[PDB]
Ligand binder design. Sequence first.
Ligand code: GTP
Ligand code: ACP
Ligand code: GDP
Ligand code: CA
Ligand code: CA
Ligand code: CA
Ligand code: CA
Ligand code: MG
Ligand code: MG
Ligand code: MG
Lengths: 438, 54, 425, 328
Amino acid sequence: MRECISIHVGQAGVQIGNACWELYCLEHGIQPDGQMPSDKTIGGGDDSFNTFFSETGAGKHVPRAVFVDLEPTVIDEVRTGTYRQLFHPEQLITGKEDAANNYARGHYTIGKEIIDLVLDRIRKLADQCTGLQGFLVFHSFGGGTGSGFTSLLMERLSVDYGKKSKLEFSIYPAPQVSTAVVEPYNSILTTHTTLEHSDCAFMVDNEAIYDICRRNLDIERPTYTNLNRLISQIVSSITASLRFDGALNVDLTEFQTNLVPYPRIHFPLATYAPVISAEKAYHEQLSVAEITNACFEPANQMVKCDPRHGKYMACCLLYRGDVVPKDVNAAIATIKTKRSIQFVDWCPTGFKVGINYQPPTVVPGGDLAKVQRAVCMLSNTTAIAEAWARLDHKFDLMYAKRAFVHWYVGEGMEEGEFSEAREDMAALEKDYEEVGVD
Amino acid sequence: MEVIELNKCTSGQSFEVILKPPSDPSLEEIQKKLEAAEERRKYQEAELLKHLAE
Amino acid sequence: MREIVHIQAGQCGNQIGAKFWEVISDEHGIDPTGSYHGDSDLQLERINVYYNEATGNKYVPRAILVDLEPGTMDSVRSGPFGQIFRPDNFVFGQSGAGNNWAKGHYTEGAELVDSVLDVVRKESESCDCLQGFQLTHSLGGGTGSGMGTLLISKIREEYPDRIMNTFSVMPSPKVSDTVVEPYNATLSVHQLVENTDETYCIDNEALYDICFRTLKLTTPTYGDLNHLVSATMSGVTTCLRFPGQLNADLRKLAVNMVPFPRLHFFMPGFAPLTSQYRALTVPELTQQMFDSKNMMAACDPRHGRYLTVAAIFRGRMSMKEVDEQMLNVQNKNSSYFVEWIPNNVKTAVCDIPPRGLKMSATFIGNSTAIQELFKRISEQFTAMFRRKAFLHWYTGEGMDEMEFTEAESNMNDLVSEYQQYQDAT
Amino acid sequence: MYTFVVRDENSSVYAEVSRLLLATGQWKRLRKDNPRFNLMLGERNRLPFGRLGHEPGLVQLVNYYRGADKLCRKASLVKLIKTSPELSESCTWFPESYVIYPDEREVFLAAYNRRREGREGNVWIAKSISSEASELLDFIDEHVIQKYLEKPLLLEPGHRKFDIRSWVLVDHLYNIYLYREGVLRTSSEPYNSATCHLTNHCIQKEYSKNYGRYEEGNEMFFEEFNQYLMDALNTTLENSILLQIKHIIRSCLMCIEPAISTKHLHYQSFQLFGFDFMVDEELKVWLIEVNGAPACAQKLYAELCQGIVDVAISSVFPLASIFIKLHH
Ligand SMILES: Nc1nc2c(ncn2[C@@H]2O[C@H](COP(=O)(O)OP(=O)(O)OP(=O)(O)O)[C@@H](O)[C@H]2O)c(=O)[nH]1
Ligand SMILES: Nc1ncnc2c1ncn2[C@@H]1O[C@H](COP(=O)(O)OP(=O)(O)CP(=O)(O)O)[C@@H](O)[C@H]1O
Ligand SMILES: Nc1nc2c(ncn2[C@@H]2O[C@H](COP(=O)(O)OP(=O)(O)O)[C@@H](O)[C@H]2O)c(=O)[nH]1
Ligand SMILES: [Ca+2]
Ligand SMILES: [Ca+2]
Ligand SMILES: [Ca+2]
Ligand SMILES: [Ca+2]
Ligand SMILES: [Mg+2]
Ligand SMILES: [Mg+2]
Ligand SMILES: [Mg+2]
C-alpha cells in the first residue's frame, strides 16, 4: 500500500476538495467524526482506503490532505463545517490577504512568504507514509493563488520529491462564473510554469460543468455547490482505483503509463455519464451501451470540444455499478461501427476498462440521482487543444495592448515572462496539431 | 476484437479490449528567480518613495 | 478582516460623507447611537470593513473628518448620525482655504496634515488586514481638493502597498461657487492620475440635470444632489459591504477595472431614479442602468468605448434573468465594448436592497468617454489661464505659473491617452 | 436583432447573402473579429471552429461543416470512396481513380497495364490527359489520376462536351436540399478523340473562339437541356440524369454525416456544396468533383442566395420551394 497526499490550493481547490472528501467519506463509510465502523484493524492497516486516510489510535481516519489559501475565509469553512473533525488544524493553512486574482502576487510576492510553511506541513504528512507515491493537486487556473502559488508549489515539489508523481485537477476559466478579467493571463502563466512538473492533469472547464448542470439537472443558475458536487463525482471515479481493490490505475504511475505517451501532452479529456436530476421521480435506468455511447457526446465532456476532428492516444473506461465485461465489449463493438474514432497510427485502437461493482454514491439531499451504473471515460485526444486555442486567443487580444500587464510587473514579474509563457503555449498547440492532424 | 489481462476480485474486474494494432531547476535556481522578483519590487518602490520625497 | 479607512475632507466631502454613513448605517442596522438593531446576519457578516467594534457591542465608523474650518463639521456633529462618529476623529482648523487649491495643498493645509495622519495611523495600526482608503471630497474647492490630494500623497508615502480609492465631485459652471474651480480641479486631477487606484467621477453637472430633468426638481439644492451621491456610494460599495464573489475588496476591484494605471476614472450609474411604489423588472433595471441619463459623470457612453464594466444588482430577483439581461446588453450593443478585453463586464448580485426599494442596480463603467469630462475642465482652465486670470490668488501662496502649465499638459495627455484606446482595435 | 461577421470577402455567394441579411433590417454586421456574433460567414482556410459555441447567450451558426474537406479534396474524395464501406470500391458512379504522390503508383500501373493488354480504352487524366502512363507520372513529379470518359455524351449541334454543376445546401439539421436549377458548363468546341476536353468556364472564355456561339457564357440551363433530351433522345432530364445525381449526392453526404454532423454540438453548421457531374453517351452519370466553396451562375445568384437565407439562416434565426429535399 502506497499513500497519496492531496493538496488543495485557493478557493476552487479548497471547495472542490471539501466536496471530494465528503464523497470519499460516504463511499468508504467514514462518519464526520472520523470513525469508520467497517474498519476492523483499529489505528492501522494497509487497506486500499488507507492510501487516502491515516488512522489514529482512537480509530479516527484522517484525510492525507493539506488545504492552502492565501485568505482565511474559505478554509475557515472547513474548520467549522460538518467534517471539521476529520482534519487536524496543521492540515489547514491560511494567509491574511490573497493574490487578488494576480498570478504574480500569488507566485512571487505572497507565495514566497508562505511556501516554506506549506512544504513543512506537507513534509509532516510525507513522514507518515511508508511508501509515498505522489500528490494530487487541486486548484483553479484563474485565481491568483490557484494559478500563482500552485506553480511555485509544483516547482518545489519536483525538488523535494523528484521521484514522486504529481497529478492535477485544474479548473479552466469560464466567464459564466468567472471573477476576474485577467484569468486568461493567469491560465497561460501557470500552465507554462507547471507544465514540466505535472505528469497528468485533468482539466475541468466550468463552462461544460455549468451547462451540464443546467441541461441535465434542471438548475436555472448553478452555484459552486452544484458544480463541485458534480466535479467530485468525476474526481471520485478517477481516484476510485487508488482507493478500492482493483487492477487498473492502481498507482499514480499507471495514470501516466496508460494515458500519457507524450509528456507535454498530459491533459486527458474526461467524459461522464449519466447525469440524472434527483427531482425526476422515475427515470429510465440507462444501459451499459447507452452510458457508454454517451461517452462520445461533447455535451457530456468536462471540456467542450470535438474529438471527431483529432486523434486518440489512449482511452480508459471506468465503470461503477452493475456492469459486466461482456456488455462493455458489445457496446464498444456497436459504437466503433457508428462513431468517428481515430487513433494515432503509432498507437493501438483499444480501451483499458475498469469495473467497480459498487455503484456511484450521491450526497444525501444533493442534485444527482442515484443510478444503477455510471462510467467515466478518460481519453487523451488532441481535440482538447481547442481549449488551449480559445485561451491563447483571449491572451493575445489583451496582451497586444498590454492590458493589465502593469499589475504583474508591479509585483516583480517581468514582461518577458508573458511572451515566454505564450511561446510555450504556441509550441504546445503545434505539438497537438502534429499528433492529431495530417 | 481481443480481450486481454482480465483481472477479477470481489469489488470488480478490469481488462483491455484491442480493436486494431498500430501502424528540473534546482532550489538555488528557483530562489534566484524569487529574490530577483522581490528586488525589482523594492527598486520600483524606492523610485516611488524617491518621487514622493521630491 | 479587510478593514477600510474612510476620509472625508472639506465642505462637499464632509456633507456627502455624512450622508453616506447615514445610508449604510441604516442598511447594516446601526442606529445613531452605534447600537445594532437589525434582523439579518448578512448585515453584520462584513460590518468590520467600515465599522469598528467598541465596548457594549457598539459599532463606530472608521471615518476621519477633516476640514480647514469648523463650520461643516459642526453641522455633521449635530446631524442625524453625528454622535456615531468617534470624537477624536474630528480634525479641523480655523482659517479655511478660500476655495484655493494652493491654500489646502501648500500653506493652510500643510499646517494641519500631520494631525490627520496621526489619526489615520491610529486607525490603520488596529487593522487586521487593511485594504486601503476611500476619500470623499470635491475638486473645485480648496480643502477637499488641495488638502485632500496632499493627504493622498502622504498616505501613499506611508502606505504604498494599499489601495487608494476616492469619490471625487467634479465642478460644473451649472452648479458653481467660484470661477477658480477649473484651476482647482485641473491641479487635483493630476494628483489623482498618479496617486489613486480608483476614482468615481461624480459630475455636479450630471447630478443637477438628473434632479431637474428626471426627478422633476425645478430648484435642486446640494441636499438633493447629495441624495443621489449617497445612493450611488451605497451601490458602488455593496460588493465591499456584503458577502460576495466578485469585486469584494478594493484590490480585486482594481484588477478587474483598471487595464492601464492612469485610466482609473469611473463613470458611476444608478437605477431606478424615480420622483415610486411600482415594481421594476430585471429588464427595466438593466436598460436604465446603462442609460446615460442615469450616469453621474455627464459623458455620453456612446461617444466612447467601455474598457471595463462592473454591475451590481440589489434585491430578491432571478439571477438567471439577470445573467440573461446582461448578456443581451453586451450582445446588442457590442460595438461599445472594446474587443481586445474579452468578457470585460462583471456582474454581482446582493440580496439586501437599499432603503425604500425592492430592487436597484448600480453601474460602474471604465469608459473612454470620460475624456469628455476632462476636456470640459481643460477648456475652462485654458480660457482663464491663457490670460493668467485669477492666478494671483495662487502665486500669492507661493505657486509658480509653471506648475499650472504642467497640470494643463498632464490632463491633456490623459485625454490623449483615452483617445488612443478609443480607436484601438 | 441578429448579428453576423464576414470573414471571406472573396465570397460572391455570401456577399449577396450578407447583402440580403442587411436589407432585412433585422440583421447587423459586426467587425470580422467581434466575437458576439450569431452567424459567421467564415473564411475558406483555417476556420477557427474551436472558438465557436463558447459565447453564453449566443446561438452561433457557421456557413461551413468542419471535416467536409474529406469530400471536397481531390485525394480526399478518392480515399473516402475506396475506404468507406458505405461506398466501397464497388462504386458504379465514380470514375476509377488513384492517388499519386510526386501512394498508389503500383496500383495505377496494374490497371493501366491491363488496359493496354486488353486493347481497350486506356486514356486517363491528371489533376490536383494522355494515353501514356509515363507522360502522366513524369508530369506529377514536375495529384490524382482517374479514367478519362472517352465515351462522353455530346450535345448537338456541335458534337461537344460539357459538365453538370449542381448546388446542394445542407442545413444544421442535416437535411439535404438540392437547388432545382443547375447549369451545364458546355464546351463550344467539337470533341476530338485525337480546350474541347476541359469544360471549365475560364478555359472556354480564354482559349475558345466560339465562346458563346451556341449558348450564352457556355452555360445551358435545365429548361433547355431537358427539352433537348426530349427532342433528341425521347427522355427527360429527371429520369435519365437527375435520379442518379440525387442518388450520388445523398450517398456522399450520408457517408460523412457521422463525422461532421453538428446535431449535438455546441455550435451549428450549414454549407453550400457544388457537385460536378459527367454524363456518358449511355446516359450514365459520373461524379467528377465536389466543390466546398462554389460560386453560382450569374442568373441564379439571386434565387439561390435567397434560399440560403430562408432554409439555412432564418431557420435558426427566424425573422418577424426552390429546393428538393433528398430524404434519408
Ligand atoms: N468549479 C469551481 N470553480 C471555482 C470555485 N471557486 C472559484 N472557482 C473558479 O476559480 C476562478 C477564480 O479563482 P479562485 O480559486 O477563486 O482564486 P484563488 O485560488 O482563491 O486565488 P485568489 O486570487 O488569491 O483569491 C474562477 O474562474 C472561478 O469561476 C469552485 O468552488 N468551484
Ligand atoms: N475523369 C474525367 N473524365 C472526363 N472528363 C474529365 C474527367 N476529369 C475531369 N474532366 C474534365 O475536366 C474538367 C475540369 O475538371 P476539374 O475537376 O479539375 O475542374 P476543377 O476542379 O479544376 C475547377 P472546379 O472546382 O470549378 O470544378 C471537367 O469539367 C471535365 O470536363
Ligand atoms: N454634490 C455636492 N457638491 C458640492 C457640495 N458642496 C460643495 N460642492 C461643490 O464643491 C465645490 C466647492 O468645494 P468645497 O467642498 O465647497 O470647498 P472645500 O470646503 O474647500 O473643500 C464646488 O464645485 C461645489 O459645486 C455638496 O454638498 N454636494
Ligand atoms: Ca484499519
Ligand atoms: Ca519530475
Ligand atoms: Ca497658521
Ligand atoms: Ca507629528
Ligand atoms: Mg481566493
Ligand atoms: Mg464651499
Ligand atoms: Mg475545384
